[PDB]
PDB file of C-alpha atoms in Angstrom:
ATOM      1  CA  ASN H   1      23.287 -56.191  79.441  1.00 52.55           C
ATOM      2  CA  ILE H   2      25.939 -54.046  77.657  1.00 55.14           C
ATOM      3  CA  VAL H   3      26.492 -54.888  74.047  1.00 55.99           C
ATOM      4  CA  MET H   4      29.555 -53.877  71.975  1.00 57.30           C
ATOM      5  CA  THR H   5      28.933 -53.047  68.238  1.00 59.27           C
ATOM      6  CA  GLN H   6      32.155 -53.433  66.588  1.00 59.30           C
ATOM      7  CA  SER H   7      32.911 -52.065  63.119  1.00 56.92           C
ATOM      8  CA  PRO H   8      33.627 -52.807  60.460  1.00 55.04           C
ATOM      9  CA  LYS H   9      32.562 -56.515  60.102  1.00 53.65           C
ATOM     10  CA  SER H  10      35.394 -57.341  57.890  1.00 56.18           C
ATOM     11  CA  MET H  11      37.976 -54.978  56.126  1.00 56.39           C
ATOM     12  CA  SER H  12      40.753 -55.696  53.405  1.00 60.28           C
ATOM     13  CA  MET H  13      43.750 -53.244  53.525  1.00 59.55           C
ATOM     14  CA  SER H  14      47.251 -53.405  52.049  1.00 59.72           C
ATOM     15  CA  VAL H  15      50.485 -53.386  53.793  1.00 59.43           C
ATOM     16  CA  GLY H  16      52.114 -50.170  55.221  1.00 61.81           C
ATOM     17  CA  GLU H  17      48.911 -47.971  55.510  1.00 61.80           C
ATOM     18  CA  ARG H  18      47.257 -46.673  58.756  1.00 61.33           C
ATOM     19  CA  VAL H  19      43.975 -48.522  59.685  1.00 61.26           C
ATOM     20  CA  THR H  20      41.339 -47.676  62.325  1.00 59.53           C
ATOM     21  CA  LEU H  21      38.738 -50.052  64.069  1.00 61.53           C
ATOM     22  CA  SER H  22      35.688 -48.671  66.066  1.00 58.67           C
ATOM     23  CA  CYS H  23      33.850 -50.229  69.111  1.00 58.48           C
ATOM     24  CA  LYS H  24      30.683 -48.458  70.180  1.00 55.92           C
ATOM     25  CA  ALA H  25      29.282 -49.577  73.450  1.00 55.22           C
ATOM     26  CA  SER H  26      25.506 -49.380  74.297  1.00 56.50           C
ATOM     27  CA  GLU H  27      25.723 -48.195  77.996  1.00 58.84           C
ATOM     28  CA  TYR H  28      28.645 -46.433  79.646  1.00 57.12           C
ATOM     29  CA  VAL H  29      32.012 -48.140  79.999  1.00 58.37           C
ATOM     30  CA  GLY H  30      34.479 -45.615  81.444  1.00 58.28           C
ATOM     31  CA  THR H  31      37.985 -46.917  80.235  1.00 59.80           C
ATOM     32  CA  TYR H  32      37.431 -50.600  80.865  1.00 58.83           C
ATOM     33  CA  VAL H  33      37.551 -51.619  77.063  1.00 58.23           C
ATOM     34  CA  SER H  34      40.153 -54.233  76.188  1.00 59.26           C
ATOM     35  CA  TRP H  35      41.418 -55.152  72.812  1.00 59.11           C
ATOM     36  CA  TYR H  36      42.338 -58.675  72.040  1.00 56.75           C
ATOM     37  CA  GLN H  37      44.134 -59.884  68.847  1.00 58.20           C
ATOM     38  CA  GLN H  38      43.155 -63.510  68.039  1.00 59.09           C
ATOM     39  CA  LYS H  39      45.070 -65.413  65.247  1.00 58.78           C
ATOM     40  CA  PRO H  40      43.454 -68.437  63.600  1.00 56.74           C
ATOM     41  CA  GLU H  41      43.902 -71.753  65.589  1.00 58.47           C
ATOM     42  CA  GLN H  42      45.320 -69.836  68.595  1.00 62.83           C
ATOM     43  CA  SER H  43      44.090 -68.392  71.840  1.00 64.26           C
ATOM     44  CA  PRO H  44      43.428 -64.649  71.954  1.00 64.95           C
ATOM     45  CA  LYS H  45      46.249 -62.487  73.180  1.00 68.48           C
ATOM     46  CA  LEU H  46      45.531 -59.229  74.975  1.00 65.46           C
ATOM     47  CA  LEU H  47      46.740 -56.254  73.133  1.00 67.47           C
ATOM     48  CA  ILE H  48      45.306 -53.037  74.996  1.00 66.87           C
ATOM     49  CA  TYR H  49      44.158 -53.505  78.488  1.00 65.28           C
ATOM     50  CA  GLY H  50      42.112 -50.505  79.659  1.00 62.88           C
ATOM     51  CA  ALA H  51      41.773 -47.810  76.957  1.00 62.68           C
ATOM     52  CA  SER H  52      45.121 -46.651  75.431  1.00 60.00           C
ATOM     53  CA  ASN H  53      47.489 -48.854  77.571  1.00 61.72           C
ATOM     54  CA  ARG H  54      49.497 -51.343  75.659  1.00 62.73           C
ATOM     55  CA  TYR H  55      50.232 -54.770  77.223  1.00 63.73           C
ATOM     56  CA  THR H  56      53.673 -56.077  77.783  1.00 61.43           C
ATOM     57  CA  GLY H  57      55.471 -57.121  74.491  1.00 60.07           C
ATOM     58  CA  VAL H  58      53.109 -55.094  72.109  1.00 59.86           C
ATOM     59  CA  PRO H  59      54.667 -52.931  69.435  1.00 60.85           C
ATOM     60  CA  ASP H  60      54.249 -49.188  69.510  1.00 59.05           C
ATOM     61  CA  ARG H  61      52.212 -49.356  66.317  1.00 58.61           C
ATOM     62  CA  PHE H  62      48.963 -50.091  68.212  1.00 59.64           C
ATOM     63  CA  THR H  63      47.375 -47.102  69.778  1.00 59.43           C
ATOM     64  CA  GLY H  64      43.974 -46.843  71.740  1.00 60.13           C
ATOM     65  CA  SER H  65      41.624 -44.020  72.196  1.00 59.19           C
ATOM     66  CA  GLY H  66      39.013 -44.146  74.784  1.00 55.59           C
ATOM     67  CA  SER H  67      35.735 -42.207  75.628  1.00 54.12           C
ATOM     68  CA  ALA H  68      32.404 -42.858  77.620  1.00 56.22           C
ATOM     69  CA  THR H  69      31.068 -45.175  74.659  1.00 55.13           C
ATOM     70  CA  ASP H  70      33.123 -44.918  71.646  1.00 56.17           C
ATOM     71  CA  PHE H  71      36.540 -46.474  71.481  1.00 53.08           C
ATOM     72  CA  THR H  72      39.040 -46.759  68.629  1.00 51.17           C
ATOM     73  CA  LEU H  73      42.064 -48.878  67.695  1.00 55.31           C
ATOM     74  CA  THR H  74      44.578 -47.502  65.184  1.00 55.31           C
ATOM     75  CA  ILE H  75      47.397 -49.546  63.861  1.00 57.92           C
ATOM     76  CA  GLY H  76      50.216 -47.562  62.133  1.00 54.24           C
ATOM     77  CA  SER H  77      52.517 -49.285  59.590  1.00 54.85           C
ATOM     78  CA  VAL H  78      50.823 -52.535  59.461  1.00 56.30           C
ATOM     79  CA  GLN H  79      53.107 -55.554  59.072  1.00 58.43           C
ATOM     80  CA  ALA H  80      52.575 -58.980  57.644  1.00 56.61           C
ATOM     81  CA  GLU H  81      51.643 -61.062  60.774  1.00 57.71           C
ATOM     82  CA  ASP H  82      48.865 -58.606  61.729  1.00 61.12           C
ATOM     83  CA  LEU H  83      46.159 -60.648  59.942  1.00 60.64           C
ATOM     84  CA  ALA H  84      43.927 -61.793  62.759  1.00 57.07           C
ATOM     85  CA  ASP H  85      40.615 -61.078  64.477  1.00 55.99           C
ATOM     86  CA  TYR H  86      40.490 -57.941  66.750  1.00 54.77           C
ATOM     87  CA  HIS H  87      37.860 -58.232  69.516  1.00 55.15           C
ATOM     88  CA  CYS H  88      36.881 -55.575  71.760  1.00 53.10           C
ATOM     89  CA  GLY H  89      35.350 -56.347  75.109  1.00 52.17           C
ATOM     90  CA  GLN H  90      34.198 -54.231  78.176  1.00 51.96           C
ATOM     91  CA  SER H  91      34.755 -55.065  81.708  1.00 51.08           C
ATOM     92  CA  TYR H  92      32.939 -52.293  83.409  1.00 51.58           C
ATOM     93  CA  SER H  93      30.258 -54.830  84.094  1.00 47.99           C
ATOM     94  CA  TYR H  94      30.164 -58.581  83.294  1.00 47.42           C
ATOM     95  CA  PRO H  95      32.342 -58.867  80.260  1.00 49.04           C
ATOM     96  CA  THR H  96      30.719 -58.885  76.990  1.00 45.66           C
ATOM     97  CA  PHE H  97      32.716 -59.119  73.683  1.00 43.53           C
ATOM     98  CA  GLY H  98      32.101 -57.726  70.250  1.00 42.00           C
ATOM     99  CA  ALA H  99      31.655 -59.775  66.977  1.00 42.44           C
ATOM    100  CA  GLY H 100      35.200 -59.117  65.903  1.00 40.83           C
ATOM    101  CA  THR H 101      36.802 -57.952  62.493  1.00 39.63           C
ATOM    102  CA  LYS H 102      38.424 -60.417  60.163  1.00 39.92           C
ATOM    103  CA  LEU H 103      41.208 -58.334  58.973  1.00 41.02           C
ATOM    104  CA  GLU H 104      42.276 -59.121  55.343  1.00 40.95           C
ATOM    105  CA  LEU H 105      45.177 -58.228  52.924  1.00 40.35           C
ATOM    106  CA  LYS H 106      44.344 -56.917  49.291  1.00 43.25           C
TER     107      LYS H 106
ATOM    108  CA  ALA G   1       1.044  -3.151  83.555  1.00 37.70           C
ATOM    109  CA  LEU G   2       1.925  -0.007  85.480  1.00 35.49           C
ATOM    110  CA  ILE G   3       3.046   1.668  82.344  1.00 42.20           C
ATOM    111  CA  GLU G   4      -0.091   0.898  80.569  1.00 44.66           C
ATOM    112  CA  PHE G   5      -2.197   2.254  83.523  1.00 45.18           C
ATOM    113  CA  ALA G   6       0.017   5.450  83.375  1.00 44.34           C
ATOM    114  CA  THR G   7      -0.648   5.842  79.647  1.00 46.30           C
ATOM    115  CA  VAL G   8      -4.407   5.366  80.092  1.00 46.26           C
ATOM    116  CA  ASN G   9      -4.487   8.016  82.900  1.00 45.26           C
ATOM    117  CA  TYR G  10      -2.574  10.380  80.747  1.00 45.67           C
ATOM    118  CA  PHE G  11      -4.876   9.997  77.918  1.00 43.73           C
ATOM    119  CA  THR G  12      -8.098  10.186  80.271  1.00 43.68           C
ATOM    120  CA  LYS G  13     -10.188  13.267  80.283  1.00 45.66           C
ATOM    121  CA  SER G  14      -8.645  14.179  76.830  1.00 43.71           C
ATOM    122  CA  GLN G  15      -8.937  11.078  74.503  1.00 43.02           C
ATOM    123  CA  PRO G  16     -11.092   8.626  76.472  1.00 45.16           C
ATOM    124  CA  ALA G  17     -11.785   6.652  73.396  1.00 41.64           C
ATOM    125  CA  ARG G  18      -8.002   5.737  73.072  1.00 37.90           C
ATOM    126  CA  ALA G  19      -7.833   5.007  76.895  1.00 35.57           C
ATOM    127  CA  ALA G  20     -10.767   2.740  76.916  1.00 36.46           C
ATOM    128  CA  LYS G  21      -9.524   0.980  73.738  1.00 36.89           C
ATOM    129  CA  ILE G  22      -6.087   0.294  74.958  1.00 34.58           C
ATOM    130  CA  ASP G  23      -7.461  -0.853  78.179  1.00 36.70           C
ATOM    131  CA  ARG G  24      -9.816  -3.504  76.682  1.00 33.54           C
ATOM    132  CA  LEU G  25      -7.025  -4.365  74.445  1.00 32.61           C
ATOM    133  CA  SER G  26      -4.601  -4.806  77.475  1.00 31.93           C
ATOM    134  CA  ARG G  27      -7.313  -7.008  79.357  1.00 25.62           C
ATOM    135  CA  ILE G  28      -6.403  -9.470  76.510  1.00 24.96           C
ATOM    136  CA  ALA G  29      -2.830  -8.885  75.598  1.00 23.46           C
ATOM    137  CA  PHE G  30      -1.239  -9.509  78.812  1.00 23.37           C
ATOM    138  CA  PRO G  31      -2.685 -12.717  79.943  1.00 22.73           C
ATOM    139  CA  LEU G  32      -2.091 -14.370  76.667  1.00 21.04           C
ATOM    140  CA  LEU G  33       1.293 -13.101  76.298  1.00 17.80           C
ATOM    141  CA  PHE G  34       2.175 -14.438  79.853  1.00 16.92           C
ATOM    142  CA  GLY G  35       0.725 -17.917  79.020  1.00 16.36           C
ATOM    143  CA  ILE G  36       2.775 -18.087  75.835  1.00 16.57           C
ATOM    144  CA  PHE G  37       5.870 -17.234  77.906  1.00 18.08           C
ATOM    145  CA  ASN G  38       5.021 -19.904  80.479  1.00 21.82           C
ATOM    146  CA  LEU G  39       4.584 -22.472  77.776  1.00 16.43           C
ATOM    147  CA  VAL G  40       7.730 -21.614  76.073  1.00 18.54           C
ATOM    148  CA  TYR G  41       9.782 -21.482  79.293  1.00 17.07           C
ATOM    149  CA  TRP G  42       8.498 -24.510  80.805  1.00 17.82           C
ATOM    150  CA  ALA G  43       8.691 -26.637  77.461  1.00 15.44           C
ATOM    151  CA  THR G  44      12.318 -25.595  76.546  1.00 15.70           C
ATOM    152  CA  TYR G  45      13.427 -26.094  80.185  1.00 17.35           C
ATOM    153  CA  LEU G  46      11.835 -29.715  80.789  1.00 20.50           C
ATOM    154  CA  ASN G  47      12.803 -30.896  77.465  1.00 20.75           C
ATOM    155  CA  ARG G  48      16.498 -31.015  78.457  1.00 19.36           C
TER     156      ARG G  48
ATOM    157  CA  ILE R   1      44.790 -60.795 108.129  1.00 23.46           C
ATOM    158  CA  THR R   2      44.095 -64.035 106.165  1.00 17.24           C
ATOM    159  CA  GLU R   3      46.588 -66.972 106.498  1.00 17.46           C
ATOM    160  CA  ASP R   4      48.095 -66.296 102.999  1.00 15.81           C
ATOM    161  CA  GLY R   5      48.892 -62.640 103.669  1.00 18.20           C
ATOM    162  CA  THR R   6      45.678 -61.174 102.068  1.00 21.59           C
ATOM    163  CA  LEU R   7      44.817 -58.052 104.278  1.00 17.98           C
ATOM    164  CA  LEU R   8      41.505 -56.372 104.644  1.00 17.27           C
ATOM    165  CA  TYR R   9      41.384 -52.877 106.011  1.00 17.61           C
ATOM    166  CA  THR R  10      38.283 -50.951 106.268  1.00 19.60           C
ATOM    167  CA  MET R  11      37.573 -47.451 107.794  1.00 17.19           C
ATOM    168  CA  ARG R  12      34.272 -45.401 108.528  1.00 18.44           C
ATOM    169  CA  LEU R  13      34.759 -42.123 106.910  1.00 17.26           C
ATOM    170  CA  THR R  14      32.786 -38.865 106.374  1.00 13.05           C
ATOM    171  CA  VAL R  15      34.051 -37.420 103.314  1.00 10.87           C
ATOM    172  CA  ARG R  16      33.113 -33.661 102.498  1.00  6.66           C
ATOM    173  CA  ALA R  17      34.185 -33.642  98.903  1.00  6.56           C
ATOM    174  CA  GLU R  18      33.899 -30.730  96.311  1.00  7.20           C
ATOM    175  CA  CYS R  19      31.127 -30.833  93.640  1.00  5.23           C
ATOM    176  CA  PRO R  20      31.528 -28.263  90.940  1.00  3.65           C
ATOM    177  CA  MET R  21      28.356 -27.155  89.748  1.00  2.00           C
ATOM    178  CA  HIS R  22      27.268 -25.145  86.567  1.00  2.00           C
ATOM    179  CA  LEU R  23      24.008 -23.429  87.807  1.00  2.00           C
ATOM    180  CA  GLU R  24      22.799 -22.439  84.305  1.00  2.00           C
ATOM    181  CA  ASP R  25      19.532 -24.640  84.574  1.00  2.00           C
ATOM    182  CA  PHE R  26      18.776 -23.645  88.063  1.00  3.16           C
ATOM    183  CA  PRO R  27      16.682 -25.150  89.295  1.00  2.00           C
ATOM    184  CA  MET R  28      16.115 -27.689  86.651  1.00  2.00           C
ATOM    185  CA  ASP R  29      19.884 -28.645  86.615  1.00  2.00           C
ATOM    186  CA  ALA R  30      21.683 -32.235  86.912  1.00  2.00           C
ATOM    187  CA  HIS R  31      24.923 -32.632  88.512  1.00  2.00           C
ATOM    188  CA  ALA R  32      27.678 -35.353  88.708  1.00  2.00           C
ATOM    189  CA  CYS R  33      29.520 -35.015  92.067  1.00  2.00           C
ATOM    190  CA  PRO R  34      32.780 -36.849  91.652  1.00  2.00           C
ATOM    191  CA  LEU R  35      34.834 -38.428  94.523  1.00  2.00           C
ATOM    192  CA  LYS R  36      38.497 -38.952  93.404  1.00  2.62           C
ATOM    193  CA  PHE R  37      40.830 -41.037  95.737  1.00  2.00           C
ATOM    194  CA  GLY R  38      44.461 -41.949  94.846  1.00  3.79           C
ATOM    195  CA  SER R  39      47.776 -42.617  96.522  1.00  3.92           C
ATOM    196  CA  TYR R  40      50.069 -40.008  98.022  1.00  4.70           C
ATOM    197  CA  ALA R  41      53.958 -40.400  97.830  1.00  5.83           C
ATOM    198  CA  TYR R  42      53.587 -43.798  95.847  1.00  2.59           C
ATOM    199  CA  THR R  43      53.567 -43.426  92.146  1.00  9.23           C
ATOM    200  CA  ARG R  44      51.991 -45.775  89.471  1.00  7.91           C
ATOM    201  CA  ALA R  45      55.179 -47.930  89.189  1.00  7.25           C
ATOM    202  CA  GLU R  46      54.822 -48.648  92.960  1.00  4.18           C
ATOM    203  CA  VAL R  47      51.054 -48.765  94.161  1.00  2.75           C
ATOM    204  CA  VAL R  48      48.303 -49.463  91.766  1.00  2.00           C
ATOM    205  CA  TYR R  49      44.654 -49.273  92.813  1.00  2.00           C
ATOM    206  CA  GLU R  50      41.919 -51.454  91.476  1.00  2.00           C
ATOM    207  CA  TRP R  51      38.283 -52.340  92.160  1.00  2.00           C
ATOM    208  CA  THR R  52      37.557 -55.537  93.992  1.00  2.00           C
ATOM    209  CA  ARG R  53      34.329 -56.545  92.171  1.00  2.00           C
ATOM    210  CA  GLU R  54      33.167 -55.706  88.787  1.00  2.00           C
ATOM    211  CA  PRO R  55      33.618 -51.929  88.504  1.00  2.00           C
ATOM    212  CA  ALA R  56      29.721 -51.575  88.144  1.00  2.00           C
ATOM    213  CA  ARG R  57      29.245 -53.239  91.455  1.00  2.00           C
ATOM    214  CA  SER R  58      32.057 -51.613  93.520  1.00  2.00           C
ATOM    215  CA  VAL R  59      30.586 -48.480  94.774  1.00  2.00           C
TER     216      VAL R  59
ATOM    217  CA  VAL V   1      51.410 -67.123  84.050  1.00  2.00           C
ATOM    218  CA  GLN V   2      50.586 -70.458  82.279  1.00  2.00           C
ATOM    219  CA  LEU V   3      47.073 -71.969  82.139  1.00  2.00           C
ATOM    220  CA  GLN V   4      46.872 -75.673  80.934  1.00  2.00           C
ATOM    221  CA  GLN V   5      43.459 -76.717  79.778  1.00  2.00           C
ATOM    222  CA  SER V   6      42.259 -80.277  79.264  1.00  2.00           C
ATOM    223  CA  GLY V   7      42.084 -82.054  75.714  1.00  2.00           C
ATOM    224  CA  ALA V   8      39.278 -82.239  73.227  1.00  2.00           C
ATOM    225  CA  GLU V   9      35.939 -84.256  74.285  1.00  2.00           C
ATOM    226  CA  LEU V  10      33.788 -86.163  72.212  1.00  2.00           C
ATOM    227  CA  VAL V  11      30.543 -86.510  73.985  1.00  2.00           C
ATOM    228  CA  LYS V  12      27.111 -87.814  73.222  1.00  2.00           C
ATOM    229  CA  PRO V  13      24.370 -85.098  73.364  1.00  2.00           C
ATOM    230  CA  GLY V  14      22.701 -85.409  76.888  1.00  2.00           C
ATOM    231  CA  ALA V  15      25.690 -86.041  78.983  1.00  2.00           C
ATOM    232  CA  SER V  16      27.839 -83.933  81.235  1.00  2.00           C
ATOM    233  CA  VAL V  17      31.360 -82.780  80.448  1.00  2.00           C
ATOM    234  CA  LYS V  18      33.806 -81.440  83.088  1.00  2.00           C
ATOM    235  CA  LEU V  19      36.736 -79.375  81.638  1.00  2.00           C
ATOM    236  CA  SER V  20      39.631 -78.360  83.808  1.00  2.00           C
ATOM    237  CA  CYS V  21      42.044 -75.513  83.840  1.00  2.00           C
ATOM    238  CA  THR V  22      45.355 -75.926  85.760  1.00  2.00           C
ATOM    239  CA  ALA V  23      47.012 -72.613  86.617  1.00  2.00           C
ATOM    240  CA  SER V  24      50.841 -72.775  86.869  1.00  2.00           C
ATOM    241  CA  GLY V  25      52.791 -69.856  87.877  1.00  2.00           C
ATOM    242  CA  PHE V  26      50.424 -68.134  90.401  1.00  2.00           C
ATOM    243  CA  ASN V  27      47.669 -68.667  93.091  1.00  2.00           C
ATOM    244  CA  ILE V  28      44.089 -68.554  91.923  1.00  2.00           C
ATOM    245  CA  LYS V  29      42.982 -67.011  95.117  1.00  2.00           C
ATOM    246  CA  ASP V  30      44.451 -63.666  93.880  1.00  2.00           C
ATOM    247  CA  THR V  31      42.547 -63.274  90.735  1.00  2.00           C
ATOM    248  CA  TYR V  32      39.232 -64.250  89.076  1.00  2.00           C
ATOM    249  CA  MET V  33      38.706 -67.038  86.586  1.00  2.00           C
ATOM    250  CA  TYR V  34      36.727 -66.371  83.512  1.00  2.00           C
ATOM    251  CA  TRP V  35      35.209 -68.937  81.166  1.00  2.00           C
ATOM    252  CA  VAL V  36      34.734 -67.961  77.549  1.00  2.00           C
ATOM    253  CA  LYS V  37      33.003 -69.995  74.794  1.00  2.00           C
ATOM    254  CA  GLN V  38      33.757 -69.373  70.980  1.00  2.00           C
ATOM    255  CA  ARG V  39      31.641 -70.969  68.199  1.00  2.00           C
ATOM    256  CA  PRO V  40      33.360 -71.520  64.931  1.00  2.00           C
ATOM    257  CA  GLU V  41      34.000 -68.376  63.131  1.00  2.00           C
ATOM    258  CA  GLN V  42      32.031 -66.237  65.624  1.00  2.00           C
ATOM    259  CA  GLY V  43      32.562 -63.801  68.300  1.00  2.00           C
ATOM    260  CA  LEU V  44      33.389 -64.749  71.844  1.00  2.00           C
ATOM    261  CA  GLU V  45      30.931 -65.294  74.503  1.00  2.00           C
ATOM    262  CA  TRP V  46      30.935 -65.102  78.366  1.00  2.00           C
ATOM    263  CA  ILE V  47      30.087 -68.272  80.341  1.00  2.00           C
ATOM    264  CA  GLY V  48      30.837 -67.338  83.867  1.00  2.00           C
ATOM    265  CA  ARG V  49      33.462 -66.198  86.502  1.00  2.00           C
ATOM    266  CA  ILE V  50      34.428 -67.570  89.830  1.00  2.00           C
ATOM    267  CA  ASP V  51      36.180 -66.008  92.813  1.00  2.00           C
ATOM    268  CA  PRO V  52      38.340 -68.854  93.925  1.00  2.00           C
ATOM    269  CA  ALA V  53      38.822 -67.454  97.588  1.00  2.00           C
ATOM    270  CA  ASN V  54      35.218 -67.466  98.358  1.00  2.00           C
ATOM    271  CA  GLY V  55      33.293 -69.499  95.750  1.00  2.00           C
ATOM    272  CA  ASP V  56      31.122 -66.589  94.441  1.00  2.00           C
ATOM    273  CA  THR V  57      30.306 -67.491  90.894  1.00  2.00           C
ATOM    274  CA  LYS V  58      28.490 -65.399  88.523  1.00  2.00           C
ATOM    275  CA  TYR V  59      26.999 -66.816  85.141  1.00  2.00           C
ATOM    276  CA  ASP V  60      25.503 -65.386  82.096  1.00  2.00           C
ATOM    277  CA  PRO V  61      21.768 -65.413  82.262  1.00  2.00           C
ATOM    278  CA  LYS V  62      21.482 -67.728  79.379  1.00  2.00           C
ATOM    279  CA  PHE V  63      24.028 -70.072  81.084  1.00  2.00           C
ATOM    280  CA  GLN V  64      22.536 -70.246  84.449  1.00  2.00           C
ATOM    281  CA  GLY V  65      21.867 -73.891  85.444  1.00  2.00           C
ATOM    282  CA  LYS V  66      23.130 -75.365  82.187  1.00  2.00           C
ATOM    283  CA  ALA V  67      26.796 -74.804  83.347  1.00  2.00           C
ATOM    284  CA  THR V  68      28.487 -74.822  86.688  1.00  2.00           C
ATOM    285  CA  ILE V  69      31.870 -73.466  87.862  1.00  2.00           C
ATOM    286  CA  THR V  70      33.769 -74.980  90.698  1.00  2.00           C
ATOM    287  CA  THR V  71      37.346 -74.820  91.888  1.00  2.00           C
ATOM    288  CA  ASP V  72      39.961 -76.721  93.677  1.00  2.00           C
ATOM    289  CA  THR V  73      42.583 -74.555  95.574  1.00  2.00           C
ATOM    290  CA  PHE V  74      44.692 -77.413  96.411  1.00  2.00           C
ATOM    291  CA  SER V  75      45.791 -78.336  93.010  1.00  2.00           C
ATOM    292  CA  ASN V  76      45.136 -74.861  91.490  1.00  2.00           C
ATOM    293  CA  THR V  77      42.379 -76.064  89.202  1.00  2.00           C
ATOM    294  CA  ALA V  78      39.197 -74.445  87.829  1.00  2.00           C
ATOM    295  CA  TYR V  79      36.439 -76.934  86.636  1.00  2.00           C
ATOM    296  CA  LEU V  80      33.580 -76.269  84.184  1.00  2.00           C
ATOM    297  CA  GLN V  81      30.911 -78.755  84.188  1.00  2.00           C
ATOM    298  CA  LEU V  82      28.031 -78.544  81.555  1.00  2.00           C
ATOM    299  CA  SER V  83      25.019 -80.167  83.220  1.00  2.00           C
ATOM    300  CA  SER V  84      22.823 -80.633  80.230  1.00  2.00           C
ATOM    301  CA  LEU V  85      24.089 -80.005  76.715  1.00  2.00           C
ATOM    302  CA  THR V  86      22.400 -80.340  73.323  1.00  2.00           C
ATOM    303  CA  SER V  87      24.067 -80.641  69.961  1.00  2.00           C
ATOM    304  CA  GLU V  88      24.650 -76.876  69.430  1.00  2.00           C
ATOM    305  CA  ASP V  89      27.326 -76.031  71.830  1.00  2.00           C
ATOM    306  CA  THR V  90      30.043 -77.788  69.734  1.00  2.00           C
ATOM    307  CA  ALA V  91      32.431 -74.641  70.495  1.00  2.00           C
ATOM    308  CA  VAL V  92      35.823 -73.947  71.844  1.00  2.00           C
ATOM    309  CA  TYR V  93      36.096 -73.313  75.602  1.00  2.00           C
ATOM    310  CA  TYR V  94      38.752 -70.811  76.831  1.00  2.00           C
ATOM    311  CA  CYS V  95      39.983 -70.336  80.365  1.00  2.00           C
ATOM    312  CA  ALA V  96      41.441 -67.013  81.306  1.00  2.00           C
ATOM    313  CA  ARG V  97      42.510 -65.051  84.317  1.00  2.00           C
ATOM    314  CA  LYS V  98      41.866 -61.241  84.943  1.00  2.00           C
ATOM    315  CA  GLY V  99      44.548 -58.877  84.199  1.00  2.00           C
ATOM    316  CA  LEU V 100      45.463 -55.446  85.388  1.00  2.00           C
ATOM    317  CA  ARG V 101      42.408 -53.119  84.237  1.00  2.00           C
ATOM    318  CA  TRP V 102      39.885 -55.957  84.516  1.00  2.00           C
ATOM    319  CA  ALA V 103      41.178 -57.412  81.104  1.00  2.00           C
ATOM    320  CA  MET V 104      41.845 -61.106  80.590  1.00  2.00           C
ATOM    321  CA  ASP V 105      45.512 -61.133  80.049  1.00  2.00           C
ATOM    322  CA  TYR V 106      46.356 -64.917  80.189  1.00  2.00           C
ATOM    323  CA  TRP V 107      44.060 -67.089  78.239  1.00  2.00           C
ATOM    324  CA  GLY V 108      44.191 -70.995  78.090  1.00  2.00           C
ATOM    325  CA  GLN V 109      44.428 -72.999  75.053  1.00  2.00           C
ATOM    326  CA  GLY V 110      40.866 -74.132  74.363  1.00  2.00           C
ATOM    327  CA  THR V 111      39.197 -77.785  74.746  1.00  2.00           C
ATOM    328  CA  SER V 112      37.360 -77.952  71.518  1.00  2.00           C
ATOM    329  CA  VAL V 113      34.359 -80.228  72.431  1.00  2.00           C
ATOM    330  CA  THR V 114      32.331 -82.115  69.943  1.00  2.00           C
ATOM    331  CA  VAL V 115      29.004 -83.288  70.255  1.00  2.00           C
ATOM    332  CA  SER V 116      27.754 -86.014  67.898  1.00  2.00           C
ATOM    333  CA  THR V 117      26.824 -89.675  67.393  1.00  2.00           C
TER     334      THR V 117
END
């Protein structure tokens, strides 16, 4: 069973600053870590399929960074509709998701 | 080992005390050093 | 040839690949012999490859 | 392309619920069909997947026997039946199809089940 420790648990950040989230896998997952953006009261939407490959319709302010275990999601100029959860889920084995990070504004 | 024997033979019949001393010392100095080297080699190459 | 067009095409190969080795821990070394296969004359915009089961259960 | 789930269910503890997921815009024989649960304000959890071309279904070890996943290729539907359920699985159930790099690109909408008396 592969577990994905996603960090941090909940962060608060202002508009227009660069932000980074980390997703450390227990075992090996080559580049099969996907990042989903789940807004409240809606269904999760795939942002980054594979490591560092944006899905069709995703702005260029999202960038992925892949490795064997550690993966990173960097957002650049953060807008006002990016207040949602951000789950990381591997697919190298049977898919197991992370706990997610409740993004906040302050 | 060969160099130690050569030194022993060079000092023999002139200073036999030093020859016997270094021979009785090399009867203990070589095996302990080889054991230490074996331990170090195997330990540092099996830990990786 | 399945009735809906889904094809299946298997071959029996004997691949002699290259496994670059760093023999600096000989003979207590560990290797990772790769096997890379891709498409020729067909770029990503035309033919994309994908494993058929969970990537841990394909090979 | 467009996954239409069922509506919310209000089921008594100890019964069986069968949630449906109709795929419109493609054939389910081409891709897999993953079922995901999500407790309120918690992380996503995998239930099981099904290969609609064969019927090969894999489940999470803690969801084996409790849930079952069947299909219907004629109407392009995926069914998830919870055999025996307690009062704890009052979560939101999503239906998703596998994407390009084994991601789940298209998700459903969620049938928020409710277990009470």
